[PDB]
Design a protein around this ligand. Structure first.
Ligand SMILES: [Yb+3]
Ligand SMILES: [Yb+3]
Lengths: 100, 98
């Protein structure tokens, strides 16, 4: 399937935090109410809580200043589910690069 | 609770009608929280066997099961506020097909 272009993020960010990155959504959401989620190292696996996504808008943010010298890349996966919990789309890979 | 482990869920093979509601996994703090499950059986193959209601926390099975093919699943439930922030620590869920 089509690959979402990776993000580039300057290390030592100053926010203010949370600092909005990009919105990851399904076009079919304003047709069918969808609930968004994100998994992987940086989201729900260590380090937890660095990348969050709004359940309704699908807007993703970073919660703190990054450092490439400690970790230069994160690979997450966005999910979309209906009001019942049935996944509507397959999981999409999200790539983020810390730069400096 | 704060590290108490949830007892395994035992479900008989050859089950309906579906989706068949199993058990409610929720956080007493439900503040409007949203629930989601991860792992083999949910968002990893075999995909879509189990699903959780975003608002209620009701875990359901979607089709019949067979012990001889897969004997048990190991999922993880999550809780996140209306803004996506993690509020609870994810819990492990074990399902044994009998
Ligand atoms: Yb640096
Ligand atoms: Yb059997």
């Amino acid at each position: 399937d089509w690959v979402i272009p990776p993000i580039n993020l300057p290390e030592n960010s100053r926010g203010p935090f949370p600092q909005e990155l990009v919105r990851i959504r399904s076009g079919r959401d304003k047709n069918l109410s969808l609930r968004y989620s994100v998994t992987g190292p940086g989201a729900d696996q260590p380090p937890t809580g660095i990348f969050i996504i709004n359940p309704i808008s699908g807007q993703l943010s970073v919660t703190k200043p990054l450092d490439r010298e400690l970790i230069a890349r994160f690979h997450l996966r966005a999910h979309a589910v209906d009001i019942n919990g049935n996944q509507v789309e397959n999981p999409i890979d999200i790539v983020i690069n810390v730069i400096d």
